[PDB]
UniProtKB/Swiss-Prot annotation:
Protein name: Thaumatin I
PROSITE patterns: THAUMATIN_1, THAUMATIN_2
Entry's family note: Belongs to the thaumatin family.
Disulphide connectivity of cysteines: C9-C204, C56-C66, C71-C77, C121-C193, C126-C177, C134-C145, C149-C158, C159-C164
Source organism of the structure: Thaumatococcus daniellii
Taxonomic path: Eukaryota, Viridiplantae, Streptophyta, Embryophyta, Tracheophyta
């Protein structure tokens, strides 16, 4: 499956693609403002994610740091990134279908649209100014808007026991972006797409 990753932001982002225990494609690349990077994701990929990293520095060998989304200091991500990270999430070829969503469960750093480029389903988007509007206690000094689990580490925010409800904090994310997950047990906003669809992830879509 192809994922075209497009940076419409006015600032550089470092795109990242991982399934948690491995890179997807090269795992990460710099995208200047306007640039597009197309990756290939193996069919059957379960639990894949794409995200943006901001304010990154890497040496010649691909080692460095990012202020949001850092994945172990690597340009080419092998693992998931450090919150806050708006997440494009997907599982491909799962009994004949693909499944996509955007999640704010790990916070928000960069607005994103995640849409198919092939027929048969809709895209999803979280493009509101969540950083500018972020509650004081959730603001990350490094940049971005943390989720409450990251800040406060309680069973209720982290849904540790699989029993949790919405919270003041999850409702903020849900209000700004109704079409993304705001906490672990949120009413799903997952889209079912035809098996082997292709996609475009656009940072700063509006
Ligand atoms: Na998923
Ligand atoms: Na999810």
């Amino acid at each position: 499956a192809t994922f075209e990753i497009v940076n419409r932001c006015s600032y550089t982002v470092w795109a990242a693609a991982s399934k948690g225990d491995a890179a997807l494609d090269a795992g990460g690349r710099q995208l200047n403002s306007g640039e597009s990077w197309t990756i290939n994701v193996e069919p059957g990929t379960n639990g894949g994610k794409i995200w943006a990293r901001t304010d990154c520095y890497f040496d010649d060998s691909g080692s460095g740091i990012c202020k949001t989304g850092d994945c172990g200091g690597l340009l080419r991500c092998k693992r998931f990134g450090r919150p806050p990270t708006t997440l494009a999430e997907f599982s491909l070829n799962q009994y004949g279908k693909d499944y996509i969503d955007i999640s704010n469960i790990k916070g928000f750093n960069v607005p994103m649209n995640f849409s198919p480029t092939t027929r048969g389903c809709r895209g999803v988007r979280c493009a509101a100014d969540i950083v500018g509007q972020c509650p004081a206690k959730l603001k990350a000094p490094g940049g971005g808007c943390n989720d409450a689990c990251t800040v406060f580490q309680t069973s209720e925010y982290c849904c540790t026991t699989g029993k949790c409800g919405p919270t003041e904090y999850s409702r903020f994310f849900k209000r700004l972006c109704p079409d993304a997950f705001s906490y672990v047990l949120d009413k799903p906003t997952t889209v079912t797409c035809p098996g082997s669809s292709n996609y475009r992830v656009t940072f700063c879509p509006t």
